[PDB]
Amino acid sequence: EGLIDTAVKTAETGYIQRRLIKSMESVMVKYDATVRNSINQVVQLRYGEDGLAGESVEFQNLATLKPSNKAFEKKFRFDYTNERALRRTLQEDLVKDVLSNAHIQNELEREFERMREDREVLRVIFPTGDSKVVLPCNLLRMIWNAQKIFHINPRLPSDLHPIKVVEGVKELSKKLVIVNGDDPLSRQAQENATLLFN
Amino acid sequence: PGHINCIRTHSTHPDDEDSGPYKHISPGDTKVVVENGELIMGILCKKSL
Amino acid sequence: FLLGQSARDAERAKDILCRLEHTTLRKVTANTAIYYDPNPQSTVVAEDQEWVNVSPWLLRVELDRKHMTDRKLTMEQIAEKINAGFGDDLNCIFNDDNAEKLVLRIRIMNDDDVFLRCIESNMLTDMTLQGIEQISKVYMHLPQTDNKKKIIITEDGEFKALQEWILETDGVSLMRVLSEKDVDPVRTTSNDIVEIFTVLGIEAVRKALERELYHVISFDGSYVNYRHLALLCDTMTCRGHLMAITRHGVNRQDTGPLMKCSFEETVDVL
Amino acid sequence: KRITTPYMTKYERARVLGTRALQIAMCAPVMVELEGETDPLLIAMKELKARKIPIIIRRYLPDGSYEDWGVDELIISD
Amino acid sequence: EEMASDELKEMRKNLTKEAIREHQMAKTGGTQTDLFTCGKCKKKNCTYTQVTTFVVCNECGNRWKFC
Amino acid sequence: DDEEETYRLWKIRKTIMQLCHDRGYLVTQDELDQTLEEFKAQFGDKPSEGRPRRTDLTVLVAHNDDPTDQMFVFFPEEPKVGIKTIKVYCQRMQEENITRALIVVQQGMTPSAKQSLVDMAPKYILEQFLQQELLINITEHELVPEHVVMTKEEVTELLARYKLRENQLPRIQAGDPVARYFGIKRGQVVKIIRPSETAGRYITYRLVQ
Amino acid sequence: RQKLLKEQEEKRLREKEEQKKLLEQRAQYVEKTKNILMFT
Amino acid sequence: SKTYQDIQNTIKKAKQDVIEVIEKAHNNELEPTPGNTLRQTFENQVNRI
DNA sequence: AACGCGCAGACC
DNA sequence: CGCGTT
Secondary structure (H helix, E strand, O other), rough: OOHHHHHHHHHHHHHHHHHHHHHHHEEEEEEOOOOOOOOOOOEEOOOHHOOOOOOOOEEEOOOOOOHHHHHHHHHOOOOOOHHHHHHOOOOOHHHHHHOHHHHHHHHHHHHHHHHHHHHHHHHHHOOOOOOEEEEOOOHHHHHHHHHHHOOOOOOOOOOOOOHHHHHHHHHHHHOOOOOOOOHHHHHHHHHHOOOOOO | OOOOOEEEEEOOOOOOOOOOOOOOOOOOOOOOEOOOEEEEEOOOOOOOO | OOOOOOOOOOOOHHHHHHHHHOOOHHEEEEEEEEOOOOOOOOOOOOOOOOHHHHOOOOEEEOOHHHHHHHHOOHHHHHHHHHHHHHHOEEEEEEEOOOOOOEOOOEEEEOOOHHHHHHHHHHHHHOOOOOOOOOOOOOOOOOOOOOOEEEOOOOOOOOOOOOOOOOOOOOOOOHHHHOOOOOOOOOOOOOOOOHHHHHHOOHHHHHHHHHHHHHHHHHOOOOOOOOOHHHHHHHHHEOOOOOOOOOHHHOOOOOHHHHHHHOOOOOOHHH | OOOOOOOOHHHHHHHHHHHHHHHHHHOOOOOOOOOOOOOHHHHHHHHHHHHOOOEEEEOOOOOOOOOEEOOOOOOOOO | OOOOOOHHHHHHHHHHHHHHHHHHHOOOOOOOEOOOOOOOOOOEEEEEEOOEEEEEEEEOOEEEEEE | OOOHOOOHHHHHHHHHHHHHHHHOOOOOOOOOOOOOHHHHHHHOOOOOOOOOOOOOEEEEEEEEOOOOOOEEEEOOOOOOOOOOOOHHHHHHHHOOOOOOEEEEEEOOOHHHHHHHHOOOOOOOEEEEEHHHHHOOOOOOOOOOOOOEEEOOHHHHHHHHHOOOOOHHOEEOOOOOOOHHHHHOOEEEEEEEEEEOOOOOOEEEEEEEO | OOOHHHHHHHHHHHHHHHHHHHHHHHHHHHHHHHHHHOOO | OOOOOOOOOHHHHHHHHHHHHHHHHHHHOOOOOOOOOOHHHHHHHHHHO
């Protein structure tokens, strides 16, 4: 029985693959960053609904997905009120700044609102709560390499102001572009394409 | 090569180990933890190579 | 997927299952015998049911009790349908729901010998007493994986998968299944392709084809990048209609003869 | 007003390397000081690294237009 | 259905219960245990099948396999 | 049947109201989601030769920004609608300046009626919908993603932006259930928004032809 | 706090706009009903 | 050795179980499992054992 | 009474 | 073969 099954499988899969290849042997990504066939008919505005190659993609987890509201709040809010914890994490030249400057407080509140919005978007986008998702860069491994290279030593108070991290992330999101163009439609498509990654 | 960092689980790794103690020190020599391109813990198998 | 309260309890779900499954006389019947009793009041058989109620021939179609109770029917509506189906041409005397035998009496009033045979045959082969066509039989299995359990974000935030009853049919209709009450008209898929194209839309077909392809390719545990599946689905659903991967679906596009002959129907396309 | 990607695709890079190696094999003036090699492919690779290949790539777009890039203008991947 | 006698009503209820029980489908078998945590719902209850160690979520329904 | 007929009529009315709202026709938020108790109380709940008779529950809703534009929703009683019915409807409609209509037939209209429907198209637009299809709203279905009927201005903007001819975009036949739901016709592009698991949201376009 | 108060007043203005839309809808239905009456 | 004894005991228990299932199916006690007929449920139970 | 079509069937 | 129109 096993030998007969192997023979019929090899006989059918051949024709199947032949048809699958003759159906799409002409599709290709054009320089306009769009997939088209031999008739220049757009099949995908962006390859793989993202415009990224399938080689430099690894599995990762969405930390802000399937959390408990209270857990998410206490984990992604950055309390700028516990002066003891602020001194424990950041340095004295930053605790006083984060306490006095209210612009920083407003910026962090706006960041948390944006984080909540992205969490709601993921929940309405990925039903059933599936954190495992394919993305290009493995940020956890990158952070680990950065730690092992720069000798962070997770114990001493670090020197990194939250405003610095916020502005760095914003500048990085502005840099990563797929749909080049200041047009409203161009910007909308760029945001929709790099949504999950950002 | 290089300073590679990765963690992997060995085939004969009891699941009821990360919860209990000996999480970062497996008695059975599982939980491959490579840092700066240097094997520290765990045994290599298909799950790692 | 059941929508109303029927999703939790099974008592109010068996009725949904029955109304979705196809029931006929051949299923709720046990024996059929054509007799030539001349006078209705004479009654060649020992049954005290015609005198209370009051052509020289009839058909005694005795129905089974277990099947009738499983489908939850009543002789009233059975007779209503068997009369409305043939018009005001027959007089089907039914029996009360208290006696042991669920007997009937089909008589015609206004070749005649075989007419009763023909009519009984064509009503037994198909009558549709309670159900829709196509759907042969419906199952009733609880969801064991997250691919079918209900998901609802509680006030606290967690998904907390809920175990609700679900029915697994064997035919295709969809148009008539979604319309039935106590049926989630949001999560009730179909498993077919042409049916979704005729019912929902081309975009729903693309999504359904993607899901079915992913299922059949990941069933064996393997993994394939979603990009390849999306590209294949898009190539199949680009020209609106579901272009088949076979010659009959690929050679219809306005690509060119040098490419159509490269695949199949060489001399023909040339 | 060029909108194509500023990176050199692998296909373009490979074709440019092969073409430059062929031009070099046919006795052509190099655009870099040779440290002591004779393989035309290696010379083309060195020329690419030095960014001195006298070639501009004409990338066509689906509409019909075309953008001309330069090996020394666009960024190289590898 | 309401006018039938007590014995007839009991028989009808029993027949309906039997039909409802037979129309159902047999649940998928497996070794239920709380040693594996489902990543789709965060619950601990689940079932394990060895044949390849497949995990089926009990409450959430997370499906996975371990080699 | 009586109760079943009332339930089907109520479900069809709800689907038509939701369809009108999606197209843009301003509808009462109340009637947009009214339950069935008020449906009974308003009509009578006696369709079996009583008060809730077809052709009386018809509705005429006007478009949002164009109050001069409206559209009827007829409910002929004839199971197999003929041609005299549509002829008299158009003759009675000719009095007003309306242009659009929508027929809700019990069963499939005769082929001879479709000829007149497409013939009277350039002067009075009217499309038919079966009750069997209106009993359920497909836009609220999980598979069916979000659709948007774009305007010629933004369509031309998209074309000029992508430097792509409208003929090159994907295709979606007008006979599509969603296309008929939105009332779109030939030569019109619909925008589709999908949850893409590799990019959050994905927006595509499809031209009807 | 004053910012929260003006946000609340903006929500009240939106509710007033909803009320005016509702009143206009009722004022147009009071006339549209006659066409539905004469239709039958 | 002890592994062989355990294997033999398991095989004998499996044989006894299948014989009991056959005896039940003959004497008409094994009720049909929902969604499956009598023979189907008998084969399923034997295969599971 | 004959013609316009459409579904089903049969046949290739 | 059936409906509806002329």
